[PDB]
Design a protein around this nucleic acid. Sequence first.
DNA 1: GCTTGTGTGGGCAGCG
DNA 2: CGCTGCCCACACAAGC
Length: 87
Amino acid sequence: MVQSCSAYGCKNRYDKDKPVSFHKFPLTRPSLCKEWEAAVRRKNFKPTKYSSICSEHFTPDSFKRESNNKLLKENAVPTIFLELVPR
DNA sequence: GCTTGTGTGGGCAGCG
DNA sequence: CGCTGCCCACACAAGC
């Protein structure tokens, strides 16, 4: 989406100049989808699993269908969201 | 190989 | 007024 990722402060709106791609939540991996919520530890929880997220938040390994079988690693959740808190 | 399934991609309304 | 929550079709890979 061209609004913002499900991360905290990542308003890295789709910019082809920057090396990032977009994707949707692991709808086919609910439990795993759920830990993504654990990464969205902020009150300002962005859109749900229906919205789209960008590459930078996960490891290339877990990027998408290019993972193991056809989706990300069930044991991988976007931790690259941020260091802690922006200013 | 072609067709179907899952990933991919962006928007509008209600409340501080 | 801006942000959060949920939906549909197409391309590539797998199956027949």
